[PDB]
Amino acid sequence: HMMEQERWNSVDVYFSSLLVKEDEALSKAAQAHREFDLPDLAVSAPQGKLLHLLARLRQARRILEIGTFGGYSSIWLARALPPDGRLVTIEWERSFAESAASRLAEAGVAHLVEQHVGRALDILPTLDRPGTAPFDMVFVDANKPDIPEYFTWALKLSRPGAVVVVDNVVLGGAVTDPDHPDAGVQGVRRFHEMLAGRSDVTATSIQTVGTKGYDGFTLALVTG
Amino acid sequence: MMEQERWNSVDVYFSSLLVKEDEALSKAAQAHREFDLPDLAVSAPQGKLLHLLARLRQARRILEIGTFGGYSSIWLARALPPDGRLVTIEWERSFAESAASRLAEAGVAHLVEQHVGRALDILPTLDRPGTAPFDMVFVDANKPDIPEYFTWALKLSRPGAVVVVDNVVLGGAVTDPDHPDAGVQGVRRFHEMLAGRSDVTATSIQTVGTKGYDGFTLALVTG
Ligand SMILES: C[S@@+](CC[C@H](N)C(=O)[O-])C[C@H]1O[C@@H](n2cnc3c(N)ncnc32)[C@H](O)[C@@H]1O
Ligand SMILES: C[S@@+](CC[C@H](N)C(=O)[O-])C[C@H]1O[C@@H](n2cnc3c(N)ncnc32)[C@H](O)[C@@H]1O
User: Fold this and answer.
1) Ligand 1 — pocket residues by CB below 6 A?
2) Do B205 and A202 touch (CB under 8 A)?
3) Cβ–Cβ < 8 Å for A63, A80
C-alpha cells in the first residue's frame, strides 16, 4: 500500500500527465541536481507551470529571479514573456548557472534571459537602472536567511501591481517557532512580519504537497 | 506534533500576519453553522489567494458558481474596480439570502449580481447581448457538473481569463479510473478535457491547511 509521499506523488503525476508538458529543455533542466550530486531543488512541473501562468496573467514583461540553479523555473518564467520581455536571473554557483545557460538555449529563450553569477545581495543593487527595473514579477528562491532583504529589493526594483512569489516558506512547520535558532526560519518569520507591518503590499501564503513533499509559498501583490 | 495539527498551526500563523477578516468576513465564515452544515467555504488564505488572482488579472467581471454564505464572494468582489461586477450563482435560496446580508455588510452589494437556481440552468442565460465577457471564473459548486461549468466558463470568458476550480483532489480518489463517485469522475473528465484542447492551459496544485488535504486547478484561457 502506498506510503504518504507515494500518494502525493501519484496525485501530482496524475495531474501533471494531463496538464503539464515538458520538452527536452525542461526534462533535462529537471535533472540538474543529478549532475551536481544534490537533492532536487527545482520547482515541480505543476509549480513551474503555476509560476508561468502567474506571469502570463500579470502580462509580465520584466521578471526577476533570485536563484537560477539549473534553469528549470527559469524556462517556465522566460516562456511567459513577450518577445520584448526579459528575465533577469541570479545564481551564486557558476557551474549551476552554466548548466542553466545550456538549458535556456535548448529551450529557445536565451534571447530573453540576462544571467548574473554572484551573491544576490551584491548583484541586486546593480539592477536598479533603466531598461532592467522596474520588474513586473519577482521570484525569490535562493537562500532563506536573506529573504527579508530580497523582499526589500523586490519592492525597490518593482512597481505597483508587481507580483512577488517567495518559495519554500514553510520549513517543515518550524516557521511558527519564535525561538527557532535557524537563520532561515527567522528570515521567513521576519519577512512575514514585514508583510504584516505595511499596507502597500498584500499577500497570502499557501501550504502545498506533491512531489516536493510538504512546503509552501507566499504570493504578494504590490499595491503602493 | 500531528501532521494535521501542524498544517492547522502553520495556516493560523500565516493568516495571523497576512489575512484580515472584518465583521462581514468573520460572519460569512460562520454561515455553515446557521445552515447546519460543515464548513464548505474557502479558508482565509485561500480566499485571499482568490482575491489576489483577481487583482493580478485586473479582473473587471467575475463569475462565481457556488455562493454558499458569501465568504469567497466578499474576497472576489473586493478585488473589483469601482465599475466591476461579480455574478454569483447559488441553488439554495436561504444560502443566497444569507450571502446577500454579508455582501451588504461588506460594502460590495452594489457590485454583485446574485442568481438563485441550478447553475446549469442559469449559465446559458448569462450569454446575453450587452454583457461583457468574464475575466475570471471561480467554480466551487457540485463536482459532477465541473466539466460543463468549465465549458461554460470558456464560452462566457475572453482570452486571458483565469478559471479556478476548487476541491479537485478528493482525497486522491481522482487517480482511480474505476471510482464509482460521479464527482470523482467529473473532476477526472474535466482534467481530461484540459489535456484534450489547446485554447486553455492549466495546472493543479495540492494544498494542505486548516481544511486538510485538497487542491485546486488554475487555468488560463488562451484562445
Ligand atoms: C532552490 S534552488 C533554485 C531552484 C530554481 N529556482 C528552480 O526552481 O529550478 C536555490 C539556488 O539559490 C542559489 N543561491 C544560494 N544562495 C545564493 C545567494 N546568496 N545568491 C545567489 N544564489 C544563491 C543556490 O546555489 C541554488 O542554485
Ligand atoms: C463549496 S460551497 C461554495 C463555498 C463558497 N464558494 C466559499 O468559498 O465561500 C458549494 C455551494 O454550491 C451550491 N450548489 C451545489 N450544487 C449546485 C448547483 N447545481 N447549482 C448551483 N449551486 C449549487 C451549494 O448549495 C453550496 O452553497
Assistant:
1) A 41-43, 67, 69-70, 72-73, 90-93, 96, 119-120, 141-143
2) no
3) yes
Cell of B129: 447581448
Q: Give the resolution in Å.
A: 1.5
The CATH number of residue A111's host domain is 3.40.50.150
Contact: A219, B13; criterion CB under 8 Å? no
The single residue listed with the C-alpha cell 508587481 is A162
CA distances from A125 to A42, A134, A223 (A): 26, 13, 22
The domain tally of chain A equals: 1
The domain of B6 spans 1-223
Pairing mode of beta strands A215-222, A201-209: antiparallel
- At B176, list the grid cell: 482511480
Residue A220 and residue B18: Cα distance in Å, rounded? 10
SS3 B76: helix
Taking contacts as CB-CB distances below 8 angstroms, the residues of chain A near B49 are 204, 206, 219
Alpha-carbon distance of B22 to B8, in angstroms, equals: 21
Give the orientation angle of helix A4-19 with respect to helix B182-195, to 10 degrees: 50
Which among A161, A195, A206 has CB closest to B17?
A: A195
Q: Which of A102, A143, A171, A188 to mutate to test the pocket of ligand 1 (most atoms within 8 A of CB)?
A: A143
Burial B135-160 (b: 16+ CB within 10 A, else e): bbbbbbbbbebbbebbebbbebbeeb
Q: Measure the CA–CA gap between B125 and B128, rounded to whole angstroms.
A: 7
Element at A214 (helix H, strand E) = none
